[PDB]
Amino acid sequence: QAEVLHLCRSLEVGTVMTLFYSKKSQRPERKTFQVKLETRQITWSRGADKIEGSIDIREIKEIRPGKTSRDFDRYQEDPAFRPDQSHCFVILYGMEFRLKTLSLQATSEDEVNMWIKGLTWLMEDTLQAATPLQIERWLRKQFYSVDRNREDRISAKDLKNMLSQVNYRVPNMRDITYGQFAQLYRSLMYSAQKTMDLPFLELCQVSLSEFQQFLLEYQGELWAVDRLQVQEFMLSFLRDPLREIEEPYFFLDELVTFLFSKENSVWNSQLDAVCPETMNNPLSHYWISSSHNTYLTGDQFSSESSLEAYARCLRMGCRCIELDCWDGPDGMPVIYHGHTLTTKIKFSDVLHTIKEHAFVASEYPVILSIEDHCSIAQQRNMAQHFRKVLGDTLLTKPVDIAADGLPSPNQLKRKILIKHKKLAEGSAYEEVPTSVMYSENDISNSIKNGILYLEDPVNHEWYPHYFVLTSSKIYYSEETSLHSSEKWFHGKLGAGRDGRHIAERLLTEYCIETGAPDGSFLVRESETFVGDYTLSFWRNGKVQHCRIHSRQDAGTPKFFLTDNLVFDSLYDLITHYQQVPLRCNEFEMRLSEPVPQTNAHESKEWYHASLTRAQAEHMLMRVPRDGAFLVRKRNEPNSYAISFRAEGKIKHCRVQQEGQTVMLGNSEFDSLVDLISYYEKHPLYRKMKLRYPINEEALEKIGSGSTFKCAVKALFDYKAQREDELTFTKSAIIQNVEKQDGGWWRGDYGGKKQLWFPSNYVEEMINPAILEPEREHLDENSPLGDLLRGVLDVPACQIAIRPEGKNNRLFVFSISMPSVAQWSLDVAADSQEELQDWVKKIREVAQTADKKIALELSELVVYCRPVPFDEEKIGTERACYRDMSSFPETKAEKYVNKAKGKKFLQYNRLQLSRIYPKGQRLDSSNYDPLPMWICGSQLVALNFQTPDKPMQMNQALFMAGGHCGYVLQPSTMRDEAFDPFDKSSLRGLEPCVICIEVLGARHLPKNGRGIVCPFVEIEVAGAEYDSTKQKTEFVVDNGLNPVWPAKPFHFQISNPEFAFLRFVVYEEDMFSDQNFLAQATFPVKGLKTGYRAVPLKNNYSEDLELASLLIKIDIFPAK
């Protein structure tokens, strides 16, 4: 305890260490680091002072000693950066699958040791800190993020902006210190929610006998019949040692804050411990947390394989992980997804990662699913490395030779098992006996896979697409992954008094609307003295003007106010008079705030001062890509619209300007220019960013880039003026046209070949390949899955290499189709060798019109022996509990339906089944695990890197047991009558009736710049007969503390042993779409009753800071 207070006190002082950026362009550099205790952040002051970096300690997942990091690996042979493991350590932090890393280089080995032990305690105390203290640190984090920390007092509009950044919009405007800021927060959170229906509930206070009456009458906490128990419960909440030495008391607002806190969670934390009693059934009786292609960080085709993903999965409590082993460059296999562009990591590194992390989250057994493409020698090296590195951790022999069933999880604690094909006794080949020429159309069975490039027909940039060639088709995806600068210089505003009036308007509106100081100013070009300038500044509610003289005399420039000092640049003049007063119109004034320009949009490619809705729509409908956009002024003042194309249709939204800001819905920006720049970087509508500014120039040049056998149409007659020129008549189609800049193209017409003609005497015929493909009847299950954009029928295509490339791409081929004149796609590869490979294989596809296993590795396979699935062995003496079978999603669906589900249940009570996603989910999306689980499948393998609903259900299921990774399947479903498609199979199992009312929410996260308009979807997920969804209405412009109207919900669950209660918070955005904000999913068996908090998670299932709902939940039958 004293050691902890000593430790924390030392790091708030600090330490200096070198930083290895997770960015390549950057070169390592040093800074000082410290732990602001009042907020629990790791801040790194750049140099002993200014604060330039920060990490929230609550996001730290691992503090790892050594140089084990990607950053470190980027400089491991550079001798300038070959540090020492003793001097290096790594913080892994974040709330997504791919954790962020802080890779640091210290000097002492007790320096690193204190930090590591400091953060370890800090991490644990921050995470379990009582909620009033977490709120208190959040309030400080918001505070130390504006002008406060300096003046120690923030403005009143700083508050408006900070509140909007935390999802709260005050109706209209209404300096403050932290104590007053925290007072305002607590008062706002309570006032905004005093309307919630709370029968139990002018800052009154609730006492001990009152809180005890609550816990008992409403919360069903029977322990609270002991008063001293509640006493501590209330003191475990407040955590103020003052006010403690008297009877505990809550204020009303502290009671409401309690109702929202993790201390009031709907989730019974008693189910967070392992129940060792439930860990004694055969392995086949457990749901086992399982990962598919564990090495991958992203999609299945081109993402990075990472050691870090193994560590993340095992630390999320995953127990069955997957290794895809291929022959490596040095006799040691590599791991990556075969036949793709995913990066390769080394088998040896993976094993050490697995060793280091397999039992941090759980003592329970780990299963390595080994997809093996290695030669016999590399299989031997694997077998040798498994045995050496894992030692007694590896399972090498059965637990019970006379058993008739798999061993229990308890019997396999701290064991790692190998799942791998096994030789028949005395054979050199697996007894493999399944004959299936139903070759799945996926990237495994394709002819060639790769990334190739396609010119965008609108901006003429090359973009990468995934290409897949099969034996008859090419599938391609959607695209993959001086003074004039100064704010105070406004240039020429007008040519006469119009410019003076514009300057007076700009300066006046700025000063009035912002309460700007005297001396606020702008500079413009002089309307009266050419080459000179005019300074305008605010003084006594009036605008003052003075001439700034300019002289190019004797070579160098000379700027000066009349009768005043001479300066070399306009910047120097202004910078000087912002520090000491000028004299102007007999007045003394120091320049202060620069007046910003407000109409920078007026010269942008996308801006149209005069344009109707109908004209904008006609313009954008000429553009065959989504993200075509323009901004138009509207007929009413201070009003604009964005017009943009999405899903082949045109949409519009109004942008209103209110003073020095602009608004789009509730999203506030500084200017139209800043607004558009924001939505070029972030999506505006669904996943659509603003990409192409549409004006006359852009429209003219659309689809103009073809090269292969191009035709053009003569617009006029042309008589050859030289012997190398073509002669032709109006409307003539000139063929095979070679296009070049400089005004002259080359083509065939009238018998003459490749003669020159004027470029602007023709229009280029349309290349239909530039148009969007019809995507409505496109194959849902191509090798590309949901990423598919287009299909080409190879026998109807022709291919030709362009030897000179095009558009700064050296390696280009052209696909055409003889029966569709002028249809052509130009396609670039990254290398001449890649180009040659694609061309030869495509052309070959067109001209068509029609495993040994090392004993040393085999010996390590004790259980989890893969055999072809034999439905007829189910229930007979021929079923071997050591044999297992794997099921690709689509095959598994054939067994988890009404017809075969009960027999799949029978199989799974004795033997393991592994389910994994279909090959076509190249995007690493996940299938629904519940229909697999409810038929007793144990190894339901999901892409852990993907933040979708299947992974949210996975982490929810394994919440029972605290993510130990094994959950005992309930006895009712290991009954032989249990049928997931027949609730009559359950017999008289008591059902469960849930009544819920969503009362309010706090600290909801944002989805962009606006303020969310949230609604809550409540779901029960189990068998089909139990599954249903309900939702609340959305509330307007509030994520910080919304409350919802009355809408009582009822759910009835016939099988509460396989049932999940799921809460999803959505926002209704301005386009009437519904966007995920947060979620919490629970097994129904762990639900408490009463007025309960619902602590909210992100889509990766990480705890959000403070975010929660308050519900009223009643469960029947009564406990």
Ligand SMILES: O=P(O)(O)O[C@@H]1[C@H](O)[C@H](O)[C@@H](OP(=O)(O)O)[C@H](OP(=O)(O)O)[C@H]1O
């Ligand atoms: O890596 P991909 O492309 O997703 O390929 C499938 C997937 O990874 C499965 O997890 C794997 O299951 P099993 O090892 O459990 O069988 C299967 O192996 P298989 O070809 O040996 O059946 C692979 O085909």
Ligand SMILES: [Ca+2]
């Ligand atoms: Ca695999």
Ligand SMILES: [Ca+2]
């Ligand atoms: Ca990791």
